[PDB]
Each structure stands twice: as C-alpha cells, then as structure tokens.
Amino acid sequence: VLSEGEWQLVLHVWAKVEADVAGHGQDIHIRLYKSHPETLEKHDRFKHLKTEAEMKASEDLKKHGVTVLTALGAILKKKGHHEAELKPLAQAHATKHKIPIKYLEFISEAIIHVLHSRHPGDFGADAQGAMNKALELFRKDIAAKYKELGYQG
Ligand code: HEM
C-alpha cells in the first residue's frame, strides 16, 4: 500500500505528463522498443517503423500511446482502488494480446526513464520511489487478474 504522501507525489508528476500526453507516450514507446526489442513484435501495425523519427511521425503510434497513458493515468488516480479499471485492461492483455508481466516491467522502466528525463525537478528520489511503488502495485494486481482469466504470463 502507498501512503497518501506517496500517492500525492505520483499524481503530482502525472499532472506534468498531462501537459503533453502524446509526446510522453511516444518517448515511452520508443524507449521500450529500443531497450527491449522483443516487445515491438506484439504490434504488427508498428513493425515498418524502423527509425525514431518514423516512430514519432506515426499518428497510429502516437494515438496508441495516448490510449495507453490515458488508461494508466485513470488507474493511478484511483490510488489503488482500481479493480474496475484493471479488469478490462487485464482481459485484453491476457486473452487477446498475450503480454507477459515481464513486458509490463519493461514499460514501467521506460515510464520511469522518460518521467525522469522530462521532469527531473519533479521526479527526485522520493517521487521515483512512489511511482515505482504505484507501478509495482499495478503489476501485482494485473497479474492476479491475468491468472483469474487463466493466463500465467
Ligand atoms: C502501462 C501498461 C499498459 C497499459 C495501460 C496499456 C493499455 C492498453 C490499452 C488501453 C489498449 C487498448 C484496448 C485494447 O485493444 O486492449 C491497449 C492495446 C494493446 N496493448 Fe497495451 N497497455 C500497456 C502495456 C502494454 C505492453 C507492455 C504491450 C506489449 C509489449 C502492450 C501491447 C498491446 C497491444 C498489442 C494492444 C493492441 C493494440 C492494437 O489494437 O493495435 N501493452 N493497451
């Protein structure tokens, strides 16, 4: 469980994300695919994007990153009370897309990296720790929902 202080730090940096959701989402996806190339194979519509500039230029990828961060931000704002928001997400990623928990660790690393790169004055040690705890809780709870659906990834 996170303390109220830790949730406030999470939501404080998230308000910064919200000034440019698209760009944060592009940088996160580009970092993810570059750091952990096995992840990009899950997206057939993104495979022809070979360079960073091609990735940034893709409206499809840009919209997808907003879809992703919108869902995540709605989850974070519930401060752990997120079952109703996690179920549809788990259902899609366990039954349709088949995304192992390890890939959710990889995108968590990419989120932390990009938040630090863009907002270092608002993402110091305690804020990084708070966001780490929140993403860990997200991953723990989505893993339990995965197993309820019969997926052990
Ligand atoms: C913070 C973590 C993540 C969040 C919040 C998130 C959210 C979403 C949302 C809201 C959708 C749209 C509804 C749907 O079609 O299911 C989606 C689609 C998708 N997700 Fe994720 N997701 C995350 C991580 C990942 C990761 C790590 C991968 C794979 C490496 C992945 C692969 C996909 C794929 C393949 C789709 C379908 C895209 C399409 O329709 O073309 N996601 N995600």
Swiss-Prot record:
Residues that bear Phosphothreonine: T67
Annotated Gene3D superfamilies: 6.10.140.2100, 6.10.140.2110
Subunit note: Monomeric.
Assigned protein family: Belongs to the globin family.
Predominant location category: cytoplasm
Domain named Globin: residues: 1-147
GO MF: heme binding; metal ion binding; nitrite reductase activity; oxygen binding; oxygen carrier activity; peroxidase activity
Binding site residues for O2: H64
Keyword Kinase: no
Residues given in the record as heme b binding sites: H93
Function: Monomeric heme protein which primary function is to store oxygen and facilitate its diffusion within muscle tissues. Reversibly binds oxygen through a pentacoordinated heme iron and enables its timely and efficient release as needed during periods of heightened demand. Depending on the oxidative conditions of tissues and cells, and in addition to its ability to bind oxygen, it also has a nitrite reductase activity whereby it regulates the production of bioactive nitric oxide.
SUPFAM superfamilies, per database record: Globin-like (SSF46458)
Gene name, Swiss-Prot/TrEMBL: MB
Protein name: Myoglobin
Highest taxon in the source lineage: Eukaryota
Presence of keyword Cytoplasm: yes
Species of provenance: Physeter macrocephalus (Sperm whale)
Residues with the Phosphoserine modification: S3
